């Protein structure tokens, strides 16, 4: 499914680290004046037109580069663009709502109506451009047994290290909101997590913890986990809700590799129903992945 | 006791800032330096050294720092922003640092409530009596002024870091809204602004 495509970096932009999807290079007309400046990165599939390439290179406002990627994942596309322009970080993903470019690459990764860029709130929670990690509570951080418990109390230390370095903490466990909330309360994690996934929740013990799963779209022509194999789109949307419109890389840590929708990194852990000292090794793996990303963009 | 140890650490940080000031080797106190408009070079050097000191603290592993910066000491009201005595603009690739010298001078000249307030302290009269029977300096006001300037430049340096890391757009947006750094430490620990809290209430 190797597909050729073009990417352009604006040589003088107002909004940085933001990418816009176009069905073709000609879509720039839809931006016209004082809109292109808000998308310093432009991505669009390539139609093998040398005259189009000539036009693009003549467009001195843009630095062009061509790369190929499978037509099924933002991961390869984003890796290619980020290595091309040496940008470890990505801004909010924008699309031309007037002319939605239907690329199978996306299929529920993330997006935004282009015109909403200016409305974005730059202020965020963590200084710099933190990483993001999503944890599937069930048997990943706790014990699958009924009387759930932290499989390895080193979970607290690992989360504190994540926070100290700077990295958004997200939970997505495919259980009842009440189940996950009470699991947090029992294992005394609670405030560790920036985002929680399973009007948010009201029990007189919590104010707002589980953003209501209002977004429903079934599947994008893929037979898999009934609910979903997790949702980069939903998690990044909640990041933006939490004022996080930038991130360095995203890692999904869970007890089930099947979900693994599209994440810059993934970590699998045992479906262990009883406590065991292994989360230190899992934390070692996660920090190794983070360091690997840091190596990819060490220069 | 413990809190006293953190107090000692904070005072040590202030003392390090004092070492930086001595390295600068200014004849006059910062109050007089700021009062003297002609000392534009001294003011710029003070600001730059404070910024570098804060950068080293905020990034202990990083010793590098911008070794050249355009500076402009502003005096007119229209050349200053309330609540941001220090600003970091860009003149099309040129990094300009604007300074509100009148505001700095005003803050420094403000009388401090050193004696006025009474606060808990080591007051064991038995120890004092036992001691009695067994038997270049900085004032509290100067220390307060110096802390005020350090914290001002800390705010300025945080805005500068937003500017460099994110860009001029986000720097302006931060100037408008400061909510980005309610969390602060999340590096930051070495910044005194992360050591206390200040609030305003309707009354």
């Amino acid at each position: 499914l190797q597909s050729k495509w073009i990417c352009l970096r604006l040589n003088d932009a107002i909004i940085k680290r933001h990418v816009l999807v176009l069905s073709e290079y000609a879509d720039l007309k839809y931006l016209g004046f004082e809109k292109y400046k808000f998308f310093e990165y432009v991505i669009f599939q390539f139609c093998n037109d040398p005259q189009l390439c000539k036009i693009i290179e003549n467009n001195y406002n843009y630095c062009m580069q061509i790369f190929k990627a499978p037509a099924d994942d933002m991961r390869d596309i984003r890796h290619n663009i980020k290595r091309a322009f040496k940008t470890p970080v990505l801004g909010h993903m924008c699309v031309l709502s007037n002319k939605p470019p239907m690329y199978s690459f996306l299929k529920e990764w993330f997006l935004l109506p282009h015109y909403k860029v200016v409305s974005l709130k730059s202020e965020s929670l963590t200084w710099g451009f933190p990483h993001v990690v999503v944890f599937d509570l069930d048997s990943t951080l706790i014990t699958e047994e009924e009387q759930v418990e932290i499989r390895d109390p080193f979970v607290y230390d690992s989360l504190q290290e994540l926070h100290e370095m700077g990295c958004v903490l997200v939970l997505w466990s495919y259980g009842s909101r009440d189940h996950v909330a009470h699991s947090m309360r029992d294992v005394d994690l609670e405030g560790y997590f920036d985002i929680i996934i399973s009007n948010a929740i009201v029990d007189y013990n919590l104010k707002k913890r589980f953003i209501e799963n209002k977004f429903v779209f079934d599947i994008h022509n893929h037979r898999s986990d009934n609910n979903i194999p997790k949702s980069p789109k939903i998690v990044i949307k909640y990041l933006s809700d939490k004022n996080v419109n930038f991130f360095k890389s995203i890692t999904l840590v869970d007890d089930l590799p099947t979900n693994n929708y599209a994440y810059d990194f993934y970590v699998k852990v045992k479906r262990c129903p009883t406590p065991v000292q292994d989360w230190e090794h899992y934390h070692n793996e996660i920090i190794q992945n983070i360091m690997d990303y840091e190596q990819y963009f060490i220069k | 006791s413990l809190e006293s140890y953190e107090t000692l650490k904070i005072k040590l940080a202030l003392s390090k800032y004092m070492a930086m000031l001595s390295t600068l080797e200014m004849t006059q106190p910062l109050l007089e330096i700021f009062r003297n408009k002609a000392d534009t070079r001294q003011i710029a050097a003070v600001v730059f050294s404070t910024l570098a000191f804060i950068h080293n603290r905020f990034h202990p592993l990083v010793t590098n720092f911008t070794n050249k910066m355009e500076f402009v000491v502003t005096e007119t009201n229209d050349t200053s922003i309330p609540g941001e005595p220090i600003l970091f603009t860009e003149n099309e690739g040129v990094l300009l640092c604007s300074v509100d010298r009148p505001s700095i001078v005003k803050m420094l000249s403000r009388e401090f409530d050193t004696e006025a307030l009474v606060n808990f302290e080591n007051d064991n009269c038995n120890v004092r009596i036992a001691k009695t029977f067994g038997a270049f300096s900085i004032t509290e006001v100067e220390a307060t002024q110096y802390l005020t300037l350090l914290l001002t430049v800390e705010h300025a340096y945080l805005h500068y870091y937003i500017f460099k890391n994110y860009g001029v757009f986000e720097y302006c947006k931060s100037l408008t809204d400061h909510s980005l750094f309610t969390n602060k430490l999340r590096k930051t620990s070495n910044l005194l602004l992360s050591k206390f809290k200040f609030t305003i209430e309707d009354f």
């Binding site: 609670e190 | 309330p82 809204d177 400061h178 602060k184 999340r186 992360s194 206390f196 305003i200």
Partner: peptide
């Protein structure tokens, strides 16, 4: 002096410190 409105909550945010859980 500038006759500009003041954002009390934003000033509080300037000097706002979050507290961790440990």
């Amino acid at each position: 002096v500038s006759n500009c409105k003041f954002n009390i909550e934003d000033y509080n945010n300037i000097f706002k410190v979050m507290e961790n859980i440990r």
